[PDB]
Ligand binder design. Sequence first.
Ligand SMILES: CC(=O)NC[C@@H]1CC(c2ccc(N3CCCC3)c(F)c2)=NO1
Ligand SMILES: N[C@@H](CCC(=O)O)C(=O)O
Ligand SMILES: N[C@@H](CCC(=O)O)C(=O)O
Ligand SMILES: [Zn+2]
Ligand SMILES: [Zn+2]
Ligand SMILES: [Zn+2]
Lengths: 257, 258
Amino acid sequence: TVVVTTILESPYVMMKKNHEMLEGNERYEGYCVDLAAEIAKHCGFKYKLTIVGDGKYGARDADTKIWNGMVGELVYGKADIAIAPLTITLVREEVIDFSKPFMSLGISIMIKKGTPIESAEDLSKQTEIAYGTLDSGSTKEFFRRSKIAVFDKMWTYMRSAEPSVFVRTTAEGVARVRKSKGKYAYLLESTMNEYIEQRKPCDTMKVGGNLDSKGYGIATPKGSSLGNAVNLAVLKLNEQGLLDKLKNKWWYDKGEC
Amino acid sequence: KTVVVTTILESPYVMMKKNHEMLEGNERYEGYCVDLAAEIAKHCGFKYKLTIVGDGKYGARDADTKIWNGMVGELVYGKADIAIAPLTITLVREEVIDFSKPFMSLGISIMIKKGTPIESAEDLSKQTEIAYGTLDSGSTKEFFRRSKIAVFDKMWTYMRSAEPSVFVRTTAEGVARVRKSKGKYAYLLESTMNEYIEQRKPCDTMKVGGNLDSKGYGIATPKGSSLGNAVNLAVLKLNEQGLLDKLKNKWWYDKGEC
Ligand SMILES: CC(=O)NC[C@@H]1CC(c2ccc(N3CCCC3)c(F)c2)=NO1
Ligand SMILES: N[C@@H](CCC(=O)O)C(=O)O
Ligand SMILES: N[C@@H](CCC(=O)O)C(=O)O
Ligand SMILES: [Zn+2]
Ligand SMILES: [Zn+2]
Ligand SMILES: [Zn+2]
């Protein structure tokens, strides 16, 4: 029975409305819940969905070099596979294995509707509207490491921002935009931004182009025997059109705005 | 040793320099994949030789003989050490060769001569006046051959049986057929190539509708080759440091004639 680490992040993994009357894997639904079922089916394994203990994606502590989040769970042998919106990055690919990507994304800007910001450049050029990112994820590192002038300017601002502009979860970033009467903008992956734009109260919007282009991968411990089969299953699901089918199911058929 | 790179003459990926005959070796060529090759080599610490695939093909396995042709075949039979090309990551290929994480995204798309009354694949499927086809021997063809979606099965049933053949030997041959056919031919090709041609003179083509699928190009190596790891890490590094996006702009949009 494969221990799968994943994260409560809509619409990837969500507790079902009636989750309290249900047990095990059946408590959960979402894109990655269906994806998990499919990968397991093709690789012929049984599995247990577990929600990452610390609620994080995964970053390395600069001082201890200890990994947190789903990454750390694989690295420390606490999970067998991570099936989640987990961004394929160079620092991570050095410690864990990733499948070929199952979904594309880029960093994007979420505003409360009516906010006068069209681009990352607009953000960078003003101080009235605060902005930040998720903690312990790939978006923060993009800004941390960027040498592109606009993104470096944005970073120099964000990291010294008082009070803090960073949030612990996506939901927190989104609620922060919604309650902030236009004075907070949130930097987050286009997948998540586009999902939220189609849900009530319909008061947010993605503006501008994506800042980069990347993908999510299924992740396994280095040298895991599961990595081969899991990668081939991602390629098969894509070619059968199932990945396209699932994006449609979870994003646009679940639309409200 | 010197790494033999297999690639293909496909704009804007690899093209002959205008003065190539007075130049030598790697210096004869230019394009997105020439720049990318130089950068991969640099970061992986290797010397290399660009070679154009002999049969000028991407790579398919013959149903009867079972031999792989194209750049895939050069890798499978040990003629090349790495392929650095707009080579689409597919399952059938990944079973015989290794791919890096993708360096560029694409989807199958439709190219029409301007003013052609077609907005989608569903439109193409529902009519016979305007003929349509694919490159004869790459991922786009095979996508249609295998597909179980009503619309694309319908399109395939038409293409495979259409006479004269709707399939072409090269991308350039597809594009010239669109341009010469007064709106009576539409070409199915990857979005990257379609969007490039859309920005070149005579500015008489365009991409219509959404992409039919989503996939990536990968750097390919022979299965279990020692280069594969360093190459994958270099692709991730070069994406993260903004080189791939810079190179896309340089070869598509900086060079735009329309
Ligand atoms: C592996 C595959 O074809 N997956 C289907 C889609 C395509 C995809 C993808 C993600 C990322 C990229 N990149 C990352 C950098 C530029 C292109 C890409 F080309 C394709 N993820 O999901
Ligand atoms: N997908 C990201 C988390 C979300 C974000 O950083 O915006 C990761 O793997 O770290
Ligand atoms: N990039 C494709 C070739 C072009 C096409 O099939 O449209 C391949 O690797 O086969
Ligand atoms: Zn399946
Ligand atoms: Zn610390
Ligand atoms: Zn470099």
